[PDB]
Amino acid sequence: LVLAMALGWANMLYYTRGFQSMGMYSVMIQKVILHDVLKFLFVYIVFLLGFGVALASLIEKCPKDNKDCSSYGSFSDAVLELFKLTIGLGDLNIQQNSKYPILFLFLLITYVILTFVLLLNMLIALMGETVENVSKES
Amino acid sequence: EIVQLLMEHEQTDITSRDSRGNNILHALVTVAEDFKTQNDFVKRMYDMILLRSGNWELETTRNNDGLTPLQLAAKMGKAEILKYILSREIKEKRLRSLSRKFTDWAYGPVSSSLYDLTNVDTTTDNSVLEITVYNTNIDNRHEMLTLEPLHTLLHMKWKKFAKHMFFLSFCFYFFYNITLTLVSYYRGWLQLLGRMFVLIWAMCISVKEGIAIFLLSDAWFHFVFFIQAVLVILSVFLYLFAYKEYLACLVLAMALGWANMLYYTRGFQSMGMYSVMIQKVILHDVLKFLFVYIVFLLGFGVALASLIEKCPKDNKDCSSYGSFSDAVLELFKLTIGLGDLNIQQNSKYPILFLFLLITYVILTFVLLLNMLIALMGETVENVSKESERIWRLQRARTILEFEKMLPEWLRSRFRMGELCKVAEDDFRLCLRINEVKWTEWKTHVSFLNEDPGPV
Amino acid sequence: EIVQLLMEHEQTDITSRDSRGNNILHALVTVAEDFKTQNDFVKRMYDMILLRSGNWELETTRNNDGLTPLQLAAKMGKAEILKYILSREIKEKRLRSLSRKFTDWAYGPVSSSLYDLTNVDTTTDNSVLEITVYNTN
């Protein structure tokens, strides 16, 4: 049910075609989600699936009677923490259950910096392609 | 006028090679800076001098460097003269042989021009195309490779084999790094087989990278691949022995390996320009931000730590920003949004602490803002053009690399061009390009095939 | 000049439909790439050939695909020729019928032009407007 409902409102964007301003706005959303954002998302997903297995392998040491000590334990949990971390929700911290906390921290900081420059470049390519394109082609 | 007089005189020797080996045409190639500078007289004098001597002697001579003027106009960054040479439609029936561009049939606006490929294709040593692609000294190679026969050769070589070899190498590297990730995540039989395949393929990559480095910001990728293979072989070596630091050698390759898959984003045009933009940005703009941010970290951290010179007094939790490392870490949290901004209780001057920290936030903000400014200012008319100009150039380099990898018989199979009889007693390789032109109408007098159609 | 000579000759058949069904005007529509490429001679020859034959026959014929040259200049992406066709103000009182743009009154700078809608409106099947809108090619 809800997966239709949540989709239904997203389809109301269709009926934004009436207004000229809102119509160009919605078509810009469509062209952007088709052209530029998928590039960012594919690279970000492969970075997630690459750094997550690493950070999880560093936690190969068992939780030793405490699951709270074992953060980044499951691969899913580590990918989730990285998705928290790109936004600002996570809890960056030096690990105690790992064997190489310095390498953990280094990989995590490099992940942040790569996500940042990747965001920066999607912004660049966006600004470069949109001029004389989204003003007219929209 | 004096050139006519010198050429008309009997004693004159047009084939006179100077101390450097260069004849007159070589000299004209060395003196062909550009159009905006010269107004294009060197091309006309090349035409004049070569038509006054109806022979292949001058373009056939090699200087002491071992180069024809065609190869010299490519090694040197001379584009107008090369465009003239590679595209020549001479009307005189006597001097038809000296041409390199021939129209074998035209019924109307349609016309199938027939370029020549003697010393342009990669069959001969140090050909024109190898010279254009395998040198960085010029910084004009986009104007060089947009010339017609070279451009169509690269497209045909892509359409035939290089696409498949590129996708094939991508698949091998894909399975390689996925086996590496399965190993790193689950760390006996499958593990042993995967480790064996990894050790096999890593040696190949290492040898390729070593040969490429010995033969030598376009080659950074080779260095990074070599670092990856080195780390992988070190890890597989240390796994047999009872060392602990093998795993640190493993993931640091794995995490690097996926970052090297950006390399194989060069295939897609959009993704290729995107990856080259990443490279140019991480080289040009981001390092400026990072150096300033690092010195700000190392400057404000010692300050904020010195304010905590008061001891933790029986509670480490009270002592935040105690160690310099902890303070730098809290500042790196704070620029993102992860930290916990708060008034300190273990300090002697909390107001000064808060002021320094707020100034740090504001300076980081304006620094981010200015990297964004300089980025937007430099990228316009740069990343839209220079991205493609670098991408297509990397593609030409890779295409010629894969063509160099193949053996002789597959080259002879995929040898582009068709043999044609350009003039009576001449049989030569040529390339057929069909063109449609509506502006210039004329009677097609010069043409090879009387029957205008494909056969 | 040769077109004048061919048209003047009595034996010539302007309505000659080729193997594909296309008469001369269809052919001109297939050969009307753009302005920057051709310098706009096809429009003039369309005008010439259609005024040399003061009839609706040529624009009325349908090819084997089932299309008039007006519909073909829309299915194919030919804009200059279509702008010519849909907007025609012929001065000759004899050949006034062949026009599609008419000025029913003008007192000064004001002028009320009167375009035509026979095969442009959606009344007829596969009209010009449907052809323009319902193709992405």
From Swiss-Prot, chain A:
It is found in: Cell membrane; Cytoplasm; Lysosome. It comes from Homo sapiens (Human). Residues 71-96 dip into the membrane without crossing it. The gene is TRPV3. Residues 17-19 are cytoplasmic. Changing Q30P: In FNEPPK2; gain of function mutation. Non-selective calcium permeant cation channel. It is activated by innocuous (warm) temperatures and shows an increased response at noxious temperatures greater than 39 degrees Celsius. Activation exhibits an outward rectification. The channel pore can dilate to provide permeability to larger cations. May associate with TRPV1 and may modulate its activity. Is a negative regulator of hair growth and cycling: TRPV3-coupled signaling suppresses keratinocyte proliferation in hair follicles and induces apoptosis and premature hair follicle regression (catagen). The chain holds residues 551 to 688 of 790 of the full protein. It is linked to Olmsted syndrome 1: An autosomal dominant, rare congenital disorder characterized by bilateral mutilating palmoplantar keratoderma and periorificial keratotic plaques with severe itching at all lesions. Diffuse alopecia, constriction of digits, and onychodystrophy have also been reported. Infections and squamous cell carcinomas can arise on the keratotic areas. The digital constriction may progress to autoamputation of fingers and toes. Palmoplantar keratoderma, non-epidermolytic, focal 2: A dermatological disorder characterized by non-epidermolytic, abnormal thickening of the skin on the palms and soles. Focal palmoplantar keratoderma consists of localized areas of hyperkeratosis located mainly on pressure points and sites of recurrent friction. This is Transient receptor potential cation channel subfamily V member 3.
